[PDB]
Amino acid sequence: NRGLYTLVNEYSARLAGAPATSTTDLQYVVVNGTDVFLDQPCHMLQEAY
Amino acid sequence: ALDKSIVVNLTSRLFADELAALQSKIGSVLPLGDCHRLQNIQALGLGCVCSSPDYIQIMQYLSKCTLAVLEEVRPDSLRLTRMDPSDNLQIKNVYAPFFQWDSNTQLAVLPPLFSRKDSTIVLESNGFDIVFPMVVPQQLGHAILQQLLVYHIYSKISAGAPGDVNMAELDLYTTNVSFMGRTYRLDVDLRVLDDLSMYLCILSALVPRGCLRLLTALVRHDRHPLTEVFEGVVPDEVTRIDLDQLSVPDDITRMRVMFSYLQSLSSIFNLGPRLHVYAYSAETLAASCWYSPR
Amino acid sequence: DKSIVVNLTSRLFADELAALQSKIGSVLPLGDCHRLQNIQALGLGCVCSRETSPDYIQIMQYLSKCTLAVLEEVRPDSLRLTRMDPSDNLQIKNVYAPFFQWDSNTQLAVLPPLFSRKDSTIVLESNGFDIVFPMVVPQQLGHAILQQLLVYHIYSKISAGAPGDVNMAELDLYTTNVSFMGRTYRLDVDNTDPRTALRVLDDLSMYLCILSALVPRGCLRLLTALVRHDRHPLTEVFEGVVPDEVTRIDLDQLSVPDDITRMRVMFSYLQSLSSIFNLGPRLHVYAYSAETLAASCWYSPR
Amino acid sequence: HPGFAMTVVRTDEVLAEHILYCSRASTSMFVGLPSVVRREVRSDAVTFEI
Amino acid sequence: ENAARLGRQVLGLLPPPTHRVSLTRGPEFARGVRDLLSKYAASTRPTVGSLHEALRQAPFRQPTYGDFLVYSQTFSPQEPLGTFLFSFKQEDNGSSMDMLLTPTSLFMLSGMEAAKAPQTHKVAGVWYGSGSGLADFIPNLSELMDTGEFHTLLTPVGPMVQSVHSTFVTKVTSAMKGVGLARDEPRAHVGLTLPCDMLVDLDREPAGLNVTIYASLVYLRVNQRPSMALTFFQSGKGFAEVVAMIKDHFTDVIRTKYIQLRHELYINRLVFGAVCTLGTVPFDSHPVHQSLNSLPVLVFANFEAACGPWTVFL
């Protein structure tokens, strides 16, 4: 909801709200984000393809 | 001589409100995930397991964990101090609710079971909520629990049948705790103790069968002589149980189930993450001690 | 420095050198904390012999007396071991034969050989002795075998006294098999000396009938409100048939200040059962490496 | 066919290889000096951390 | 010539000397603080010689002493240096002075028989008159032996180290952790001393670096009035065996108690004893028998003291 010069600053830095894990069997939810390299653009635009 | 300093960095600065709440709890025993020194915020506190709580899953976790003490809270980061076995430290009494420690006592480290204002500090600069344990003297630490274990049982009988429990008789003998000549009125509005009351009552019916079945098998000339004395403490009605009404494959699974609720209930009260205070000042709240695991 | 050199007073051969080579880095208990030591102290089978019946309690009861040491070097004239100080950071390597996966922050304890004596016993015929090895096991199975080994010595006494009491086929599968996650394991208990396993059972019957004399009645009345009303996931041992003795204690009414004095006294006899379910020493692992099988723990006995 | 349709939502990953451009003199770096402080002493090893 | 080679292996394996900084002179304070700071700064750099200087450090630990401040009416001036100490903390609102219970003093609070302990009653008859001044402070030596809460109040501390005994108030220093040394600078090994009357020794058996010393406080009733009893034990058998060995010692007491309490038997009466863990003794150190005005008193060398909680046994 904040202005889009404080969202572009916050886009790549903060890992967003509860994304999935990687290289698992059943797609669990991530925690501790250790070496987690995720980019989810559908969390900002609020859309699905 | 040796380094014990666990610098907890933060990805973002603390709020002006969130900083001053941690400034108070600057002497405080905290569980902590790993022993190395560069860690994130997600490794400290009981928020890894407690941020819908359960009792035994935290109590068994506090034995296996690595405990540490606050020493400094700067804005951008924290700094702790790792607590070794037989290691002298300097703890401050800060825990809400206040219990008035004493010198030459044996402080034990318990899970929190009071409200979410006394236990945790909610941080929103980073999205994590650190949880402080319950550091209470050991003799008071069990009287504070064996009375609330009484309260959690009788508040389930009056939910099923309200005519059996007197509310006025209940909160006159349970909510008061007398230790060291002082009375502590506790605060109760208990989903923490729903693991014990289902383990202590599931053990409540296996013991009258389990002590007769274990006496009818152990009868011989070579009986240990003290068991002749405790052959009379068992009541009249317990010595009228017919052990033939259960099958032989059923009487095995009422021992192996029974012996596991004997030990695992006995183990969590003989857990030893305790620490021996040898100096305490009642108005400065600073106490020296030495840690002693198990 | 701390070390233990152990002589092999005769000699040793080339087959048992390769047998002692595979058993390197394993914890054995030995007799005395001297720098010099002979072969008679290192065996856990100085009490666990072949021609006599073993006593798995007394073997385990022997194990909380001894000092515990880790092998480093196997020589044809000597065995050089390193010892374990009672408050010491050290390293232990997962050599042990029923493979159970450890991790960091686990809780180890040393047990007698309870699944295969023949694996642990390697015989040194050049000196007229056999050296017997324990197994280090996390305490979730450390206790669960001692729960199972005492259930055997209850029901084996009933079946050997009169075989019409106990059906033998249900006796073998239930009293010998240890239930673990994924796997069930068969204990090596067929010809034992149960004479010190009954003294442990003769100490339960003092603590247990005290616990039956002062059950708090509010916990009894919560069972009768739970075994026939609700279907809870761990009460399903108790079916709708409640035990009849529980209902025959319901004849008195509830009293809160007379169940505080029962909850408190029952509480201090539950703290007494940690003198009868004791394991040996404890090894608090604080780091583990799964590709090398090397744990680094903290030794604290008793 | 029961009397309701449904919409079905998924999430799917992609191993993407990336290109990072970064312009000249964008950042100023400050580098200190290393220091050696030991922090685990055992019977087998005396560790350090630089 | 070969002894000159050993003169290098000694002088290269010694610990580094402790720095002495003179605080009385002026230009000798400058030369002493500088050699802290010029020598610590070369124990931090990442070269090989600076890592060579960080490996010579010898971290020997020191015990943690307690400072206790006792009435002289409840602590005798004739106490052997190394007597064990029990604290007592029933009430807190005073917080003026402290009660310390030596085992020859707690023998009078119990009222146990002089035929169980023959020698230590005569010595407790000359250090204390009738046990009154010990028992003037506790109005519950009849209601803590019924309800069974006496062991919950004692916290074991450690042996005597230093006692400046005065006429009215005695100042006592103990050693809680570690080997008990005298805090004063000619440091002597003040080991723990027990009378041979109290201690009951339990013992092919292996020995470690350890033989512990336990304290059992046993409730009983003599002359149909409540009166406890306290004995000391010594065995390196592990906690599972000693609890089985203590119950053999008290078979004749459990039988003769519950006969006296056959008809009336309240729930508070059931608790019987409690076992603490007082400290360890290294094997190869035998205790030396010693007589004091005559009282047969063991003395232990290198008793390093620990502390365990009281666990009820029956």
Side-chain angles (χ1 to χ4, degrees):
Chain A
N1 200 7
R2 297 178 288 174
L4 61 88
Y5 288 107
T6 63
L7 295 176
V8 176
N9 292 319
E10 197 181 359
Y11 182 76
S12 64
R14 298 292 181 91
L15 184 143
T21 56
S22 299
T23 312
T24 55
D25 295 332
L26 288 176
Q27 194 175 3
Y28 296 99
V29 64
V30 78
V31 71
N32 201 9
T34 62
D35 284 333
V36 171
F37 292 109
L38 260 293
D39 292 327
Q40 43 185 358
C42 294
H43 190 272
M44 181 179 179
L45 297 175
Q46 295 295 320
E47 69 182 2
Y49 298 102
Chain B
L2 193 146
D3 196 1
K4 45 183 79 70
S5 68
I6 301 168
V7 176
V8 176
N9 289 318
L10 302 174
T11 60
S12 66
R13 295 175 65 88
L14 291 174
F15 288 162
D17 195 5
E18 294 179 354
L19 191 147
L22 275 74
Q23 292 294 324
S24 296
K25 296 180 180 179
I26 204 165
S28 180
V29 175
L30 268 69
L32 184 54
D34 199 359
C35 65
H36 64 280
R37 65 104 184 268
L38 285 173
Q39 293 170 355
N40 49 1
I41 188 171
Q42 289 85 18
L44 63 94
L46 288 172
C48 187
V49 65
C50 189
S51 67
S52 65
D54 293 328
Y55 180 77
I56 303 172
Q57 294 177 356
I58 298 176
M59 187 65 203
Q60 291 179 355
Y61 179 71
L62 289 174
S63 68
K64 294 181 180 180
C65 185
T66 296
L67 296 173
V69 178
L70 263 298
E71 193 176 1
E72 183 182 2
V73 178
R74 61 260 186 96
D76 59 349
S77 175
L78 299 175
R79 182 177 61 81
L80 299 170
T81 296
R82 186 172 59 85
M83 177 161 72
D84 282 333
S86 69
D87 196 4
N88 297 115
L89 288 182
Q90 185 176 3
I91 301 174
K92 184 177 179 180
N93 202 168
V94 81
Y95 296 96
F98 183 74
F99 288 106
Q100 186 61 43
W101 300 353
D102 196 1
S103 67
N104 290 313
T105 57
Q106 297 180 358
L107 268 62
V109 176
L110 276 77
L113 51 89
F114 291 99
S115 296
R116 299 290 294 166
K117 298 181 291 295
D118 293 329
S119 178
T120 186
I121 290 177
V122 173
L123 300 173
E124 293 295 326
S125 299
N126 294 316
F128 186 74
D129 295 332
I130 70 168
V131 176
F132 294 89
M134 183 180 173
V135 177
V136 169
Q138 183 181 4
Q139 295 299 112
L140 198 154
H142 300 103
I144 199 69
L145 189 141
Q146 72 187 359
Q147 293 180 358
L148 294 178
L149 187 63
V150 167
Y151 182 79
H152 186 269
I153 292 167
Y154 286 103
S155 67
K156 296 291 179 67
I157 296 172
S158 69
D164 291 330
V165 186
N166 298 115
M167 294 293 108
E169 295 291 330
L170 187 63
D171 290 330
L172 186 62
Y173 295 97
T174 65
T175 194
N176 289 318
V177 174
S178 66
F179 179 71
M180 196 59 72
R182 292 185 297 270
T183 64
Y184 295 101
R185 184 176 177 87
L186 48 89
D187 194 3
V188 165
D189 196 1
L190 282 77
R191 291 188 299 274
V192 180
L193 297 174
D194 60 356
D195 292 331
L196 293 176
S197 298
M198 283 69 164
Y199 289 182
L200 193 142
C201 287
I202 209 70
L203 187 273
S204 173
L206 295 170
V207 173
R209 185 178 296 276
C211 201
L212 186 139
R213 182 60 176 169
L214 198 145
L215 280 171
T216 59
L218 300 177
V219 57
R220 76 282 302 275
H221 64 91
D222 202 0
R223 174 179 282 179
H224 181 71
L226 290 175
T227 62
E228 185 180 1
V229 179
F230 297 97
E231 193 172 2
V233 182
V234 56
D236 195 3
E237 183 63 31
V238 183
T239 61
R240 291 178 181 176
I241 298 170
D242 291 331
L243 50 88
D244 202 7
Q245 64 185 357
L246 293 177
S247 65
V248 182
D250 198 4
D251 205 3
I252 306 296
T253 62
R254 291 185 186 272
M255 292 294 172
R256 293 177 60 191
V257 170
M258 175 183 175
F259 285 113
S260 68
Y261 294 116
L262 284 176
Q263 191 270 322
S264 66
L265 187 61
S266 70
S267 69
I268 65 169
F269 296 116
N270 286 322
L271 284 177
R274 66 179 62 86
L275 53 93
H276 300 284
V277 176
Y278 65 98
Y280 180 73
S281 61
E283 63 185 2
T284 315
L285 301 175
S288 297
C289 70
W290 65 88
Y291 180 71
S292 67
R294 55 95 59 218
Chain C
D1 193 5
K2 59 180 183 294
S3 67
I4 294 169
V5 57
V6 175
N7 290 319
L8 273 300
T9 181
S10 298
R11 284 176 76 89
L12 58 87
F13 293 103
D15 195 3
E16 62 187 1
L17 192 145
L20 288 172
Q21 188 60 254
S22 178
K23 299 290 187 291
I24 199 66
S26 178
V27 174
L28 61 82
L30 58 91
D32 293 331
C33 293
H34 293 287
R35 296 292 302 273
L36 186 62
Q37 188 61 255
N38 290 318
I39 196 171
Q40 293 182 357
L42 272 67
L44 187 144
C46 63
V47 64
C48 182
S49 294
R50 294 181 180 178
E51 64 182 1
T52 63
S53 296
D55 193 355
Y56 287 166
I57 294 298
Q58 182 69 44
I59 290 162
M60 181 180 174
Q61 195 177 1
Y62 179 77
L63 189 145
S64 66
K65 290 179 179 176
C66 295
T67 183
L68 279 76
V70 180
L71 277 79
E72 289 180 352
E73 296 173 354
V74 173
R75 291 180 179 178
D77 289 332
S78 295
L79 292 174
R80 291 181 67 191
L81 285 80
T82 182
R83 59 182 292 169
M84 296 165 75
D85 288 334
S87 180
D88 196 4
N89 291 322
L90 57 91
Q91 186 183 7
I92 184 169
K93 185 170 75 177
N94 192 4
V95 189
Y96 293 89
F99 183 74
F100 297 110
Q101 181 68 40
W102 299 348
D103 53 351
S104 64
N105 291 319
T106 189
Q107 186 68 39
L108 297 179
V110 182
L111 289 172
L114 290 169
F115 301 112
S116 294
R117 294 175 69 191
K118 188 181 286 184
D119 193 2
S120 175
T121 58
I122 56 168
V123 60
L124 278 72
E125 293 179 353
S126 179
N127 208 166
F129 184 75
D130 51 348
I131 297 170
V132 182
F133 294 146
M135 59 187 292
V136 301
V137 169
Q139 285 188 354
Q140 294 179 355
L141 280 166
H143 289 151
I145 299 167
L146 193 146
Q147 313 308 106
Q148 183 62 256
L149 192 148
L150 294 176
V151 170
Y152 182 77
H153 293 291
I154 294 170
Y155 290 96
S156 70
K157 186 65 187 295
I158 300 171
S159 67
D165 291 331
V166 176
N167 299 115
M168 295 296 172
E170 299 294 327
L171 183 67
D172 195 7
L173 197 148
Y174 288 165
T175 60
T176 62
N177 290 319
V178 172
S179 67
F180 182 67
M181 57 181 183
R183 300 291 178 89
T184 60
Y185 295 100
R186 174 68 172 86
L187 291 174
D188 197 1
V189 184
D190 55 353
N191 290 318
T192 57
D193 192 2
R195 65 182 181 177
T196 66
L198 295 174
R199 185 176 176 86
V200 175
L201 291 173
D202 288 332
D203 293 332
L204 281 174
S205 66
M206 291 186 287
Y207 294 114
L208 191 60
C209 281
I210 293 173
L211 294 175
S212 71
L214 45 89
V215 178
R217 304 293 179 88
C219 184
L220 284 170
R221 291 177 63 89
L222 194 145
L223 282 170
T224 62
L226 191 145
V227 299
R228 66 175 67 91
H229 293 284
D230 297 331
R231 293 176 66 89
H232 187 74
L234 60 91
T235 191
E236 292 178 353
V237 175
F238 293 95
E239 292 295 329
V241 179
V242 65
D244 199 5
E245 194 274 336
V246 179
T247 62
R248 299 294 294 162
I249 310 299
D250 193 73
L251 56 90
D252 287 329
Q253 294 178 355
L254 287 174
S255 61
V256 177
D258 287 334
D259 285 330
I260 300 298
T261 62
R262 290 182 182 180
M263 186 63 73
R264 185 179 65 244
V265 173
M266 185 181 174
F267 187 80
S268 65
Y269 288 108
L270 264 61
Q271 290 182 355
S272 67
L273 292 175
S274 65
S275 68
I276 203 168
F277 296 110
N278 279 317
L279 299 173
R282 291 181 182 178
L283 295 170
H284 300 279
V285 176
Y286 62 94
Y288 185 76
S289 297
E291 64 184 1
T292 319
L293 301 177
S296 66
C297 58
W298 180 67
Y299 180 78
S300 67
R302 295 177 183 269
Chain D
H1 192 275
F4 64 98
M6 60 183 71
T7 77
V8 173
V9 183
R10 291 190 284 110
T11 53
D12 293 324
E13 288 185 353
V14 168
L15 281 172
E17 292 178 351
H18 286 271
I19 299 176
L20 180 67
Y21 181 78
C22 52
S23 65
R24 183 180 62 85
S26 299
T27 309
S28 70
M29 301 305 293
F30 295 100
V31 177
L33 289 177
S35 67
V36 174
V37 180
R38 67 179 182 179
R39 59 182 296 141
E40 289 182 356
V41 176
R42 295 180 185 175
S43 299
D44 295 333
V46 179
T47 74
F48 292 93
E49 184 173 0
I50 300 179
Chain E
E1 191 272 330
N2 201 5
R5 184 180 181 271
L6 272 68
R8 294 177 181 176
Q9 291 181 356
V10 170
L11 273 70
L13 270 69
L14 291 173
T18 307
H19 296 285
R20 298 287 181 181
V21 174
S22 67
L23 269 66
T24 63
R25 293 181 63 191
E28 292 291 327
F29 181 76
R31 291 180 65 191
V33 174
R34 185 179 176 181
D35 290 333
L36 268 67
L37 303 175
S38 297
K39 191 182 287 185
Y40 176 72
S43 296
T44 315
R45 291 183 180 92
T47 189
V48 184
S50 69
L51 190 147
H52 190 195
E53 297 292 326
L55 265 54
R56 195 176 288 172
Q57 301 292 319
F60 62 97
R61 293 178 66 89
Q62 293 178 356
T64 62
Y65 297 100
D67 291 331
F68 290 158
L69 202 146
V70 193
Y71 292 95
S72 66
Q73 56 187 349
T74 62
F75 184 79
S76 298
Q78 295 179 356
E79 292 291 330
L81 189 64
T83 312
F84 193 74
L85 271 60
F86 292 96
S87 295
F88 185 78
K89 295 300 291 182
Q90 183 180 2
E91 63 185 1
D92 190 76
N93 200 4
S95 295
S96 297
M97 281 169 274
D98 195 2
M99 181 182 291
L100 272 61
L101 294 175
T102 62
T104 60
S105 297
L106 183 56
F107 185 78
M108 294 299 290
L109 281 80
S110 67
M112 62 180 287
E113 291 291 327
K116 299 293 187 292
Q119 185 65 40
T120 64
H121 187 273
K122 183 176 73 175
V123 182
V126 68
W127 293 351
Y128 298 98
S130 66
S132 65
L134 292 167
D136 285 332
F137 290 160
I138 306 104
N140 287 320
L141 285 179
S142 65
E143 296 177 354
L144 292 172
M145 303 179 184
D146 287 331
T147 62
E149 292 180 354
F150 187 80
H151 68 275
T152 62
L153 296 174
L154 296 182
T155 60
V157 175
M160 281 172 66
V161 170
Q162 183 179 2
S163 293
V164 181
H165 183 78
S166 298
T167 299
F168 293 95
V169 171
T170 303
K171 181 70 170 65
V172 178
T173 302
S174 64
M176 294 182 184
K177 284 175 68 177
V179 179
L181 279 75
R183 186 191 282 177
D184 294 337
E185 193 67 30
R187 293 181 184 270
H189 291 284
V190 178
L192 174 137
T193 64
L194 298 176
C196 297
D197 198 359
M198 295 295 173
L199 188 143
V200 177
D201 197 359
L202 277 305
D203 53 356
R204 182 177 179 179
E205 291 181 354
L209 195 61
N210 190 358
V211 44
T212 60
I213 293 170
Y214 293 152
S216 70
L217 191 143
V218 167
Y219 294 146
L220 58 90
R221 290 180 65 191
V222 76
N223 291 317
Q224 294 178 357
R225 290 178 68 188
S227 68
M228 65 182 70
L230 179 138
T231 58
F232 287 147
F233 293 106
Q234 180 178 2
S235 67
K237 288 180 177 67
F239 186 71
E241 303 192 6
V242 184
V243 177
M245 294 296 287
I246 292 168
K247 293 179 183 180
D248 290 333
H249 191 198
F250 294 103
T251 301
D252 292 332
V253 179
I254 297 169
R255 293 177 65 89
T256 58
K257 178 192 284 193
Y258 291 158
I259 291 170
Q260 297 296 110
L261 282 78
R262 182 176 179 180
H263 295 86
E264 58 91 16
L265 183 62
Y266 295 151
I267 295 172
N268 291 317
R269 298 290 191 273
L270 272 81
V271 58
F272 183 76
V275 172
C276 178
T277 298
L278 304 181
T280 66
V281 175
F283 183 74
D284 77 353
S285 68
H286 291 176
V288 177
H289 291 82
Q290 184 65 253
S291 295
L292 297 175
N293 58 0
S294 296
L295 186 61
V297 175
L298 290 173
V299 57
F300 292 101
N302 295 317
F303 176 79
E304 60 182 2
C307 182
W310 295 96
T311 62
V312 178
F313 71 100
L314 177 55

